[PDB]
């Protein structure tokens, strides 16, 4: 669902502003976590390769 209004008043402006901030914050948060997961993923893969060679 979305919010739309024919009246160009303060209430309409507030809803648009709040939504923009939330979406921007969530997008930035997603990028940071994924980068951490990718970095950890490489580390564990390297350990497995070393263990396999030892065996």
């Amino acid at each position: 669902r979305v919010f739309t209004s024919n009246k160009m008043d303060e209430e309409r402006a507030k809803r648009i502003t709040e939504q923009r901030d939330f979406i921007q914050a969530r997008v930035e948060w997603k990028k940071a976590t994924i980068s951490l997961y990718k970095e950890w993923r490489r580390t564990f893969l390297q350990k497995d390769i070393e263990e396999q060679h030892t065996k």
């Binding site: 709040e18 939330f22 914050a25 969530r26 940071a32 976590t33 951490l36 990718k38 950890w40």
Partner: protein, 123 residues
């Protein structure tokens, strides 16, 4: 007996969940890696990773234990924490805090008494 699962789900997601292990009005939680669609306290798990005691002690703090190395391993594989687990990891500094959406609904005026008839009898 409770052998841990090894094969990953093919049609569902893995999540990090809280399991209720308390007593009457004395909650206690255990963190484990389980299939998304299951019973709350089901015995099917991939690993148990931590514990949490939400109530304050004489020192005024809550206590939380976690495996730092294994949390990263499962987060890399694709396990998705729930909303409350995100809060615990955010405060503990394992991952950045997750922003919450704005709230407009008038909050509940009876949250600790609405679901407890014993208090309402005295009220």
């Amino acid at each position: 007996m409770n052998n841990l699962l090894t094969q990953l789900p093919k049609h569902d997601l893995l999540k990090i969940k809280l399991v209720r292990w308390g007593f009457n009005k004395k909650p206690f939680y255990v963190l484990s890696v389980m299939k998304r669609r299951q019973a709350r306290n089901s015995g099917n798990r991939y690993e148990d990773i931590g514990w949490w005691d939400p109530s304050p002690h004489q020192d005024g703090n809550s206590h939380f234990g976690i495996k730092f190395d294994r949390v990263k391993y499962w987060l890399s594989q694709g396990a998705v924490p729930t909303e409350k687990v995100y809060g615990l990891f955010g405060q503990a500094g394992i991952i950045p805090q997750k922003p919450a959406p704005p709230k407009y609904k008038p909050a509940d005026g009876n949250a600790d008494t609405k679901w407890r008839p014993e208090l309402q009898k005295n009220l």
